[PDB]
């Protein structure tokens, strides 16, 4: 090309068929932090974290930046927008989630407690029984069950939803 736009990027990455690969680290302590926390390993950056870092303006995907880069990553790897928005929100709060084993979930650990977050979206109904069974399964794995409801405009609301035999 002419000139590559690197200024204002803390790292640069490429999108490949199944992942984001970090090609340049312009701020060493930035990438070392992503490595320390577990999201970056040998150039491979977790998909949701790559989308998040792009949304912050710290990760450049080639010459694509900001939320435009975030979208490239979400669309490119087939991430759910609402799961990404909850993920970003949790990261903004200082939490460090991972993709959970159960479909549609994020898990993060805070204060020696593990939280399992089920991401629900307006316009996509679910069975009350499925909510009970999911909550039971989370509790059975020693996770606090949190539901994150994203409305049709992107407003996020969190509740703890605990399955029990008797009110208490």
């Amino acid at each position: 090309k002419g000139e590559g736009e690197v200024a204002g990027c803390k790292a640069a990455a490429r999108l490949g068929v199944e992942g984001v690969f970090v090609e340049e680290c312009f701020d060493g302590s930035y990438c070392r932090n992503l490595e320390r926390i577990g999201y970056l390993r040998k150039g491979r950056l977790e998909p949701l974290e790559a989308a998040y870092q792009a949304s912050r303006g710290m990760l450049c995907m080639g010459e694509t930046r900001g939320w435009a880069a975030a979208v490239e990553v979400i669309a490119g790897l087939g991430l759910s927008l609402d799961t990404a928005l909850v993920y970003f929100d949790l990261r903004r709060k200082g939490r460090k989630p991972l993709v959970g084993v159960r479909r549609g979930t994020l898990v993060y650990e805070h204060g020696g407690r593990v939280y399992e977050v089920l991401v629900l979206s307006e316009g996509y109904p679910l069975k009350i029984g499925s909510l009970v069974e999911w909550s039971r399964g989370a509790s059975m794995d020693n996770h606090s069950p949190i539901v994150a409801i994203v409305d049709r405009t992107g407003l996020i609301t969190y509740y703890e939803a605990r399955a029990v035999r008797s009110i208490q």
Partner: protein, 180 residues
């Protein structure tokens, strides 16, 4: 060891004996006085209106004897038939019974926009009731209906309950606002 009599009329049982009406309300907060919306303790004349669900429960517990207006006996199984034949009352009965058997007082959730208001000892005694919404596990909801429940409980405790019932069995989801 309270005993009361009632007349089945519409989908309700009316207890017109004042002393029986007062007893039922005093000893467990059953029923609704028709002359006073929220009594002070026992000071009302009645009659006490029992819901069909309450009447089935009390009959089955041996506390209440129900007659038709013609004076014939309405058995527990006749009340059960009435309750089971109404999809809403059938569902509510199963939760109603489970909470009462567990020692809660269970009242209408009308004023709170819910199916039940559930107390450990009674209205005006608990700081706040548990606000309980009834579901079958087969019911589908939009996720924003969980937020609607939260809005309803926001002034109360933001800590509400979904009672989930099928096959006579009940379990509960205790839901509260959360800040990650």
């Amino acid at each position: 060891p309270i005993k009361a009599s009632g007349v089945l009329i519409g989908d309700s049982v009316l207890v017109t004996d004042v002393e029986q009406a007062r007893s039922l309300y005093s000893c467990g907060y059953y029923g609704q006085p028709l002359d006073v919306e929220k009594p002070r303790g026992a000071d009302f004349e009645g009659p006490l209106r029992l819901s069909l669900i309450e009447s089935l429960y009390l009959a089955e517990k041996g506390v209440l004897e129900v007659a038709k207006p013609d004076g014939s006996s309405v058995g527990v199984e006749d009340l059960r038939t009435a309750v089971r034949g109404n999809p809403r009352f059938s569902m509510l009965y199963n939760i109603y019974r489970d909470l009462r058997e567990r020692g809660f007082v269970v009242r209408s959730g009308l004023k709170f926009g819910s199916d039940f208001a559930v107390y450990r000892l009674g209205p005006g005694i608990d700081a706040a009731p548990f606000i309980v919404h009834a579901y079958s596990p087969e019911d589908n909801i939009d996720p924003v209906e969980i937020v609607r429940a939260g809005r309803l409980s926001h002034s109360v405790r933001k800590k509400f309950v979904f009672a989930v019932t099928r096959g006579g069995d009940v379990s509960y989801l205790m839901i509260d606002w959360f800040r990650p």
